[PDB]
Structure 1
């Protein structure tokens, strides 16, 4: 009375604490920087729910600043990825030099607010 092999989830992982026999449940998760999409767990009643997906969390485009630019700005930003600011000729930077893309509640949000350039 045993269930089919869970299989596998790209960029995520199937957890199996109590076997896969009748009554056992498998849980699902994803690698940091990704958020699960679909059933968060399947129960061996043949499994109850089908396998979910792991989609990558992205941070919205970084903010721009006055009298300041972003060095080599890419298209997308994932977990741990960072953006770096530099003040223009004649200005001095206040605040932090660079912000990092984070993952909050399966939503990519930037570490903090962009720095400021003063004269």
Structure 2
């Protein structure tokens, strides 16, 4: 069982990160700095905890001269496609040992957004803590005010709860 290290930035376009190391330890901190004329969006001071992800939002340097904005270049994932106009798509993929979770390709929408979720580089040991899972489930399912689940007027919703009877646990009638 190997010591917990932290994914190295496969690239940080239009800026720099301080410091640069072949591998990052636990609780190591990086300062993300932008070049001139590029505005930062995300966490600059980022330290990555025992979960394996850096604290805060991904740091992006943007110039703001397109239809949609820079989707960011997450840590360990490298971006192909510098065109941010409409109908333009970018590709994301991970380095050795990392698996991509998100959108393999994001296409700029006519609303001004990208079609899909922000990709990330994940490993086998990494797990999502229950608290952020609940937060994301609430954010996706509900609308913050408190919170509420709105629907179309004079309309209802349907839920399809699907379980797996695989030969892994399947014990005592789905205990829990």
TM-score, normalised via structure 2 length: 0.31
Which one has the bigger helix percentage?
2
- Structure with larger Rg: 1
Which one has the bigger strand percentage?
1
Higher relative contact order (CA 8 A, sep 6+): 1
